[PDB]
A paper describes a structure:
The first was the alginate transporter, AlgE, an 18-stranded β-barrel protein with a molecular weight of 51 kDa that resides in the outer membrane of P. aeruginosa. Crystals of AlgE grew readily as thin plates at 20 °C in the cubic phase formed by 7.10 MAG. The crystals displayed anisotropic diffraction to 1.45 Å resolution with electron density of excellent quality enabling the modeling into density of 459 out of 479 residues in the protein. Two stretches of the protein were disordered (109–117, 440–449) corresponding to loops on either end of the barrel. The hydrophobic surface of the protein is coated with 11 lobes of density that have been modeled as 7.10 MAG. They are configured in a way that is reminiscent of how lipids that make up the bilayer membrane in which the protein resides naturally are arranged. The structure includes calcium and sodium atoms as well as sulfate and citrate ions. The citrate sits in the core of the barrel and is taken as a mimic for the mannuronate and guluronate components of the alginate copolymer. As was observed with AlgE crystallized in 9.8 MAG, the hexahistidine N-terminus folds into the core of the barrel where it associates with the citrate and sulfate ions. By contrast, AlgE gave rise to a sample in which the cubic-Pn3m phase with a lattice parameter of 111.6 Å dominated.
Author numbering: 13 to 108, 118 to 439, 450 to 490
Amino acid sequence: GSSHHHHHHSSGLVPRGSHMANSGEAPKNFGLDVKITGESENDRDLGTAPGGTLNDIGIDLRPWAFGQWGDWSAYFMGQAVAATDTIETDTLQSDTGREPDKSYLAAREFWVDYAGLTAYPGEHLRFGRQRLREDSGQWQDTNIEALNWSFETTLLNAHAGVAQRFSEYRTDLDELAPEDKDRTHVFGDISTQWAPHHRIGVRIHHADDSGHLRRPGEEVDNLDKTYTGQLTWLGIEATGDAYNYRSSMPLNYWASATWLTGDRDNLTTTTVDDRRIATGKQSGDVNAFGVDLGLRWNIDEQWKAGVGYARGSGGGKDGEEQFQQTGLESNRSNFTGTRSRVHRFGEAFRGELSNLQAATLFGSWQLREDYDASLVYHKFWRVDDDSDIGTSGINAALQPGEKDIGQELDLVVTKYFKYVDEPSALIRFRGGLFKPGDAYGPGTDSTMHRAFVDFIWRF
Ligand SMILES: CCCCCCCCC/C=C/CCCCCC(=O)OC[C@@H](O)CO
Ligand SMILES: CCCCCCCCC/C=C/CCCCCC(=O)OC[C@@H](O)CO
Ligand SMILES: CCCCCCCCC/C=C/CCCCCC(=O)OC[C@@H](O)CO
Ligand SMILES: CCCCCCCCC/C=C/CCCCCC(=O)OC[C@H](O)CO
Ligand SMILES: CCCCCCCCC/C=C/CCCCCC(=O)OC[C@H](O)CO
Ligand SMILES: CCCCCCCCC/C=C\CCCCCC(=O)OC[C@@H](O)CO
Ligand SMILES: CCCCCCCCC/C=C\CCCCCC(=O)OC[C@@H](O)CO
Ligand SMILES: CCCCCCCCC/C=C\CCCCCC(=O)OC[C@@H](O)CO
Ligand SMILES: CCCCCCCCC/C=C\CCCCCC(=O)OC[C@@H](O)CO
Ligand SMILES: [Ca+2]
Ligand code: NA
């Protein structure tokens, strides 16, 4: 069930001979996930700077081990990558002692788990570097060192945990991103299925930085923090089979509203002879708000379509209304109603919900467990046209006073195999075409793309 070590993986594949493939089989003690990935990307800086283009291939091997003894269990998954350039073989990868190598080894997960606090198999406590994920992917979808308690039953779901990055556990990245250094996350949620297939819930997340900012006069480089924060996200979420590709209902929906409160100390800098020097810091409250809404029409067993709107506040008095996400999110979810997860704000733009408004349209198709396809359109705007947006897959400056971020068309197409009841492999095309709007200004490329083919096999 939900405690299975691959439960959260987007692939949704089942190895031949596993207990999940046939319940008469014993749980596997080991396996191998093999991934071959090609990536073409051009041009992430919209032509404004040298580099930013990829046309490259790689292999990513992920052996894993699992043991189970009464209420105790334990899991390890390693990772070895070899590629022709530094492509993305991992949708959850650290965004980048921060220069990745073409080839590297990593310890992806390593945890121990105790399920004995209660008799519910959906209840367990997990300690170590582990996959944390909730269904929207907008709060947590990452591998991180954590102590996390899960409780999943028919009428009640709840979770609580703490997490913090201490290393990347990678042979090529020796340092943490500044945003992660000394940042502790505590989180939890409670929800209930108040009617068959409809859930309502509350969610909380708190991030606290124990690190310090550079002092005035000190040089500032890319490994220093830009701010320290104490931030709390408090949300309400309602869903009707939002992320369930097997739904029986004719309509599926999601609605969430999140209030971000707390305080940030923002480092100030100036440039002095081509160098960046700290000049001080300024504190201020944050009082910001995010919303994501979606409606999906299940037209028949195979065809679906829908619409989405999301907005993360921006700007405001001393920047207090600048919404931002936890930093643990992927923003990838099954929001098109298929077995494949899709980036909620574009495979190319990869928007974070921060000073950003997005309108989305999608269609999808699927056949049994054998195929799926999704076509997604997005239009993006800034909320406050004198404030930055958050992270994105585009490295180009925004022009003050322009709200038109751009538009994007994405296509995902997947074949599952090894008709197959429980597939053990897949081949997927995932592409996004991004058309920058007026916020990107003159001299930028008219279009940009990011496209992948992935072949994944689980043994
Ligand atoms: C404590 C904080 C970090 C978590 C530590 C987790 C380390 C776990 C790495 C282990 C991988 C899974 C299997 C190890 C034990 C397997 C074992 O000998 O089981 C006995 C038998 O059932 C099969 O060999
Ligand atoms: C090993 C480190 C532990 C850190 C966390 C401390 C745990 C303290 C005890 C927690 C208990 C949580 C269970 C509460 C809910 C139980 C429940 O609703 O019913 C359980 C019962 O009906 C079935 O056996
Ligand atoms: C229902 C089963 C799913 C069917 C899947 C069909 C796959 C279609 C794949 C198509 C890929 C390439 C599409 C053309 C690219 C056009 C393009 O880049 O235009 C750029 C230009 O318009 C910008 O001004
Ligand atoms: C259902 C069909 C959907 C897509 C159909 C159109 C064709 C898709 C072509 C694939 C594009 C992904 C781009 C990355 C592929 C890997 C790549 O560029 O390899 C470069 C080399 O092999 C290394 O030099
Ligand atoms: C700009 C986008 C277009 C406008 C969209 C407007 C959408 C309005 C937002 C939807 C509100 C969600 C209502 C909650 C759903 C669950 C509900 O109604 O009650 C849950 C239970 O009854 C609790 O027992
Ligand atoms: C343009 C983008 C916005 C479109 C989506 C807006 C709507 C999002 C969904 C939110 C609320 C819909 C109302 C919930 C209805 C479900 C419900 O209460 O069912 C009642 C119960 O009897 C079910 O069996
Ligand atoms: C279920 C039957 C098949 C799916 C039904 C339609 C859903 C798929 C359509 C999605 C994306 C394709 C591109 C749409 C272009 C949108 C566009 O240009 O919007 C107008 C533009 O002025 C900006 O608002
Ligand atoms: C089948 C279609 C159903 C879904 C319709 C789309 C979803 C709701 C659209 C409503 C509002 C979102 C658009 C906000 C636009 C704000 C805006 O353009 O501000 C900046 C403006 O100066 C243009 O650059
Ligand atoms: C019904 C299908 C609609 C087609 C439009 C989908 C847009 C998202 C996909 C993005 C880009 C094109 C995908 C096909 C392969 C692209 C590719 O290999 O580009 C090579 C690159 O060197 C282009 O110069
Ligand atoms: Ca470039
Ligand atoms: Na339990």
